[PDB]
Amino acid sequence: HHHHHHSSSVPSQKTYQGSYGFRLGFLHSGTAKSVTCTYSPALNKMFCQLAKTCPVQLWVDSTPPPGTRVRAMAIYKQSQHMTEVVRRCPHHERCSDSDGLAPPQHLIRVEGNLRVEYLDDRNTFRHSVVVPYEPPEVGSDCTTIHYNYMCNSSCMGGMNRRPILTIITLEDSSGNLLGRNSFEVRVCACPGRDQRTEEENLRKK
Ligand SMILES: [Zn+2]
Numbered sequence: 001h002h003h004h005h006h007s008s009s010v011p012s013q014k015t016y017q018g019s020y021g022f023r024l025g026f027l028h029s030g031t032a033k034s035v036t037c038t039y040s041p042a043l044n045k046m047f048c049q050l051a052k053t054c055p056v057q058l059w060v061d062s063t064p065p066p067g068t069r070v071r072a073m074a075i076y077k078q079s080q081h082m083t084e085v086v087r088r089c090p091h092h093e094r095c096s097d098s099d100g101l102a103p104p105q106h107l108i109r110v111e112g113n114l115r116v117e118y119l120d121d122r123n124t125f126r127h128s129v130v131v132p133y134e135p136p137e138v139g140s141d142c143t144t145i146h147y148n149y150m151c152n153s154s155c156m157g158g159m160n161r162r163p164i165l166t167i168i169t170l171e172d173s174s175g176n177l178l179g180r181n182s183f184e185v186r187v188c189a190c191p192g193r194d195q196r197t198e199e200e201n202l203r204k205k
Contacts, residue, residue, distance in 0.1 A: 003105075004125040006083045011073060011126070013167050013182045021061030022170045022179025025142060031192035040195050042202055045184040046166070047191035051097075053111060054147040056168065058133065060179075067173030068133035070145060072108050073126060077163040077184060085125050088151045089158030097150070102129070107158075108166065109148040133170065152187040159187075 017023060026039035026046070036052040039045070048054050058070060074086040086107055087093070093104045102109045103118050106127050110116045117130050134143050147166075151158050163184060170179035188194055 003087075005085060007085055007124045007126055008083075009124050009126075010082050011075060011167055012180065013075070013165055014180065015182070016177065016180040018170070018177070018179040019062075020064045020170070020178060021059075022181065023059045024168060024181040024183070025057030025059050027055050027057070027144075029195075031196040033190070033192055035192040038191050038195055039183070040199055042199055043184070043195075045186060045195075045198070047186050047188065047195040047198075048149060049189065049191060050152040050187055051148050051150055054149065055144050056147060057142045057144050058168075058170070059142045060170075063135055064133060064170065064178060065172060068178065069130050069171050069173070070133050071128050071130040071169045071171060072110070072145075072147060073128040073167050073169075074107050074164050074185070075126075075167060076159075077165045081162055085127065086164055087127060087158060089155040089160075091156065092151050092158070102150075107149060107151055109150060111146050111148055113145075149185065149187045152189070154189070 029039050029041055037048040037054045076082055076084055087105045088107055098104055101116055106118055108129050110129050110131050113131050115132050119128050136143050153161050165182050166185050167182040172178055
């Protein structure tokens, strides 16, 4: 459809635990050359490869009500590009790599969930992917959602080498905000090397 490049609104990226003590967790922070997705606690930044699985843990202090959902949305980190809608580059939008659920223009996808829903906001023009919140299995302390980023920092067009932030919101069935957390994301070829070097850069900052 006729694409809108900019949005009249910028979603908040402010951390909010809310009534249920909503917080994100990440599996590991290792930086081996074989790593496909890792997280830097010091930088609150995820480093991952194109289309690879990105586990994100959802933690709560108490069970939220039925119908609770979890939304993911990307926005450009630099204020300058903040109103530009984050979307896939022409190449990826047109390569026919859809899994049958995700519209081709969406940067963020969720894998392994038949109840996933993709939204193209007709008011804000922002893209987002939502799944039902699934309370942890008996014995488990959290639940994990597996995201996929379908463009990287080397793509022509789209992000065009610009840094982005992923904003995760816990919402009720009415669309009200229950919690929010965000982290920067760098989709690249060597996540391990980049994280190990960027953490070094921070240490000398
Ligand atoms: Zn791309």
